[PDB]
Design a protein around this nucleic acid. Structure first.
Lengths: 396, 49, 252, 32, 109, 15
RNA sequence: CAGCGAAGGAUUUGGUGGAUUACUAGCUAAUAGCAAUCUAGGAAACUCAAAGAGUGCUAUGCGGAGUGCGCGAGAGCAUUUCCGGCAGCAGAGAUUUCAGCUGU
């Protein structure tokens, strides 16, 4: 993995200019740090693919473009007149679902539409559970609903009973969806049982954003109380709680190396070593008198005047795509990526034939919609009843 | 101040000539490969079918 | 601007880096020697070893190439990747390439320099990135199949735009099109810069100077009946006239 | 224990150590 | 892909060769990089005897560097580890693979 | 009131 | 054909710049700091995208010994039995490699 370090006592890691690292880094990554400027349509939600291969931009007015960004390749660029809140890819670059004004639509590789969902009667946040082939939607109505996108079925019409769903986020390790409502409740859900599995109470007021670490072990949340919480998940214990950051945190995103990303409206602030369990690893803003027991943030970047509506890291590169009002920017964050991707599942050099074969392999090995569990290792177990020691018909 | 990023370098991963096979570089991390039990359970279902 | 051209810019930016197998073979298949289905199966060591043989025979017919053996045609050069290293060493790389290109500007009648430069094309990718010095170094041989080949494989710079209907056409570009290439001072200031480097390296010779002088008198001929254009065109032709007299060669 | 010149000439082949090439490339100027 | 099988056949000799102090991991990953490329070019399709020859040449050179850093750092002739026979036995294994795949050329024979 | 509530309806469709 | 008529006339079309609403300066954590820092219609291709079929392509698994057995042997058993140490000797072999001895 890449990294940086001060290697002095004067300069710091956070007051490092993107111009400076774009000068001191190689030409390929300095060329990959793209900055699209799109003005006439609205704020641009950003969704990369599961690998780093493509990019889906949505303007809130009308504008969705699925494009390769490494090579400049227009795949599907369409202005549909109604508003689009968010959108995502499905399993490849070949399909992408856009959450339009009310009806959620899904689209082919070249921009044709394929399904106007009669259900998902509105939508605000989509996600895709990739091993389960489940397109999950939540929004203004209190309905979290799951869609098996392979056979085109519905799976679960889960009633939230908590008003709208302010921010949802997928746990990438046990595939439970963490909704965060207006109550401060971050309730985490599975399509098998209607009652919400586990109702965390993270923040006060509405919860603005949730982001799950890729190891499934930490959950970072921001509320409109100007508060950010780090959560253990496997033990359900509030790790540490940054109170009173000087503006409401709009979005959080955690990279693939445990790297916290907080969007403070016009700011992007990145903390390294913020997902440990100590008291040192609480992310702060100042080393008070030069205190070596703080997390002064790893990097920071103040934008010009534009509200950043969503962060999102690039999977297998050291750069994060942040989406704001007047367009998209990639930010060189040198420790923000798995260098050693595993090419058996997802590959940033994948060609056409292995793309077809990898998707049909996942399509045969799609996990069923029932085994979404709070812990993934509870399938080869025995029942909690029908007691442990077996009896071989001698003492019954 | 020392800065280095990934050096993907596009030569070890895509072959130089059009016949030899590319790498499948590979990380055996349980962090990478998420569902052990459900995935190989469904492979057992597919095998019995 | 719009999205399509806004990322056609980044496509032209990262045209040098191969991102998968199809773009890799469409980039590797450019060659000064072999055609497409032959060139797509070469490896780097093969063209490197026959290029090093071409270089050493070219270095015994001209004693100023062992430096390029030591620093550009070495054995580590087949592992040296261009677009993986920083701007300062890529600046070192392409000024060394420009040194080689003006030095080997003379030898294009003889095939050792073709096999010497083809590995440089195939490895350091001068047919996309370092295109300008290549074109206006080999511009003298414009009736030759080496120039037809190199213009068929080149990506055409914004200056030489009159040649874009001569790519992959069997007709060599004509003298009138060469004059219409030479007929703007945006090109001419470039070409005078190049001739200044040729003077201060003494890489001048009787064929490049003949061709340069013939195109300059044809430019002045086209601008005979344009007084404003001729008065605009004075301080570059007279400038290299005075820089041309500062050298020692009778021909310049 | 000091590193040997012949050992490091072998190491430039074993590791593919192009920093000698980059150093010589930077050091090279048009002196002729 | 049996190239993965060969590539993790060669791990334990470099494991012991790193845990005793003659290489470090920051360069055994480099020789592992070049060994990965060589194995892929070897048991890929459309391969050649020159690929086998360069693999033999590289492995003989890293054997000689192994002996050089063995007598320099450890000041002994050998460290009686697994590596000392391993590197030439896999040279012989490369030779065996090349003769089975290409029994034509008497130069490689 | 408290931090976390974990309800214990064991699921009769992954029994 | 005509006339009009100051060193040309008359058209096609791209790009940029200015308007298309009524002109109080930029940023941020905003009773202040910043502005150097918030830090401690048909046809060309290398135009691309998506499928399909055919042709190929290999698609491709402790050691020298010595010591007693296994019907001239290795296809297994088993090891201190010397070694895979040190310099020299002198027979060789292209400085570094082998052949037999002294001590070790």
């Amino acid at each position: 993995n890449g990294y940086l370090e001060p290697e002095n006592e004067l300069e710091k890691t956070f007051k490092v200019q993107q111009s400076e690292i774009k000068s001191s880094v190689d030409v390929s990554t300095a060329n990959k740090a793209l900055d699209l400027s799109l003005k006439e349509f609205g704020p641009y939600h950003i969704k990369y693919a599961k690998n780093g291969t493509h990019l889906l931009i949505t303007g809130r007015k009308g504008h969705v473009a699925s494009m390769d960004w490494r090579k400049g390749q227009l795949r599907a660029e369409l202005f549909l007149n109604e508003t689009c809140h968010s959108a995502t890819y499905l399993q490849n670059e070949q399909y992408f679902a856009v959450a339009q004004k009310k009806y959620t639509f899904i689209y082919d590789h070249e921009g044709t539409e394929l399904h106007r969902l009669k259900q998902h009667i509105e939508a605000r946040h989509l996600d895709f559970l990739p091993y389960h082939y489940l397109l999950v939607t939540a929004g203004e109505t209190g309905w979290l609903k799951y869609h098996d996108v392979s056979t085109g079925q519905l799976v679960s019409e889960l009633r939230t009973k908590a008003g709208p769903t302010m921010a949802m986020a997928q746990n990438p390790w046990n595939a439970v969806m963490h909704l965060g409502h207006s109550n401060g409740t971050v309730s985490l859900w599975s399509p098998s049982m209607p009652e919400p599995l586990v109702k965390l109470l993270s923040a006060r007021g509405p919860v603005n954003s949730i982001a799950i670490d890729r190891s499934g072990y930490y959950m970072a949340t921001t509320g409109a109380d100007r508060s950010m919480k780090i959560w253990d998940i496997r033990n359900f214990k509030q790790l540490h709680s940054v109170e009173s950051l000087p503006t409401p945190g709009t979005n959080v995103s955690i990279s693939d190396t445990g790297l916290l990303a907080l969007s403070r409206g016009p700011h992007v602030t990145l903390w390294k070593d913020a997902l440990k369990l100590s008291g040192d690893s609480k992310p702060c803003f100042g080393s008070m008198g030069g205190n070596p027991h703080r997390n002064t943030p790893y990097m920071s970047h103040l934008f010009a005047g534009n509200k950043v509506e969503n962060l999102g890291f690039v999977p297998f590169e050291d750069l994060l795509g942040v989406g704001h009002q007047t367009g998209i920017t990639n930010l060189i964050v040198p420790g923000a990526g798995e260098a050693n991707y595993d090419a058996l599942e997802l590959n940033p050099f994948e060609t056409k034939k292995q793309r077809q074969e990898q998707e049909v392999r996942t399509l045969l090995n799609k996990l069923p919609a029932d085994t979404i569990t709070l812990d993934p290792n509870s399938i080869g177990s025995v029942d909690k009843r029908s007691s442990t020691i077996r009896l071989n018909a001698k003492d019954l | 101040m020392k800065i280095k990023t990934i050096k993907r370098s596009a030569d070890d991963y895509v072959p130089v000539k059009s016949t030899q096979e590319s790498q499948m570089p590979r990380n055996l991390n349980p962090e990478l490969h998420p569902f052990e039990r459900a995935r190989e359970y469904t492979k057992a279902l597919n095998a019995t079918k | 601007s719009s999205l399509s051209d806004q990322l056609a810019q980044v496509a032209s930016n990262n045209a040098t880096v191969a991102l998968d197998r199809k773009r890799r073979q469409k980039l590797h298949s450019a060659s000064l020697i072999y055609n497409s289905k032959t060139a797509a199966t070469q490896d780097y060591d093969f063209i490197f070893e026959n290029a090093s043989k071409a270089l050493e025979e070219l270095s015994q017919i001209e004693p100023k190439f062992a430096i390029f053996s030591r620093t550009l045609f070495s054995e580590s050069s087949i592992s040296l990747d261009r677009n993986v290293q920083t701007k300062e060493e890529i600046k070192d790389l392409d000024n060394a390439i420009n040194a080689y290109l003006l030095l080997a500007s003379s030898k294009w009648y003889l095939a050792p320099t073709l096999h010497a430069t083809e590995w440089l094309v195939r490895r350091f990718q001068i047919h996309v990135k370092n295109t300008e010095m290549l074109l206006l170094s080999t511009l003298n041989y414009y009736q030759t199949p080496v120039f037809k080949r190199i213009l068929s494989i080149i990506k055409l710079p914004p200056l030489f735009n009159c040649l874009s209907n001569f790519v992959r056409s069997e007709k060599p570009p004509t003298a009138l099109t060469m004059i219409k290439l030479f007929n703007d001072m945006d090109f001419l200031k470039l070409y005078t810069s190049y001739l200044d480097q040729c003077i201060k390296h003494n890489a001048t010779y009787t064929n490049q100077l003949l061709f340069t002088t013939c195109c300059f008198i044809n430019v002045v001929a086209f601008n005979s009946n344009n007084d404003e254009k001729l008065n605009q065109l004075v301080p570059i032709l007279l400038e290299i006239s005075a820089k041309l007299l500062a050298s020692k060669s009778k021909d310049c | 224990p000091p590193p040997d010149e012949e050992e490091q000439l072998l190491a430039k082949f074993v590791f593919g150590d192009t920093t000698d090439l980059q150093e010589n490339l930077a050091k090279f100027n048009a002196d002729f | 892909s049996k190239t993965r099988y060969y590539l993790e056949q060669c791990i334990p000799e470099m494991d012991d060769l790193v845990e005793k102090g003659l290489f470090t991991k920051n360069e055994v990953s480099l020789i592992m990089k070049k060994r990965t490329d060589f194995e892929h070019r070897l048991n890929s399709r459309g391969s050649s005897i020159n690929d086998y020859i360069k693999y033999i040449n590289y492995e003989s050179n890293v054997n000689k560097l192994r002996a050089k850093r063995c007598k320099r750092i450890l000041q002994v002739k050998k460290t009686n580890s697994l590596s000392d026979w391993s590197i030439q036995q896999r040279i012989g294994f490369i030779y065996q693979r090349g003769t089975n795949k290409f029994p034509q050329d008497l130069k490689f024979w | 009131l408290q931090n976390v509530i974990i309800n214990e309806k064991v699921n009769k469709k992954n029994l």
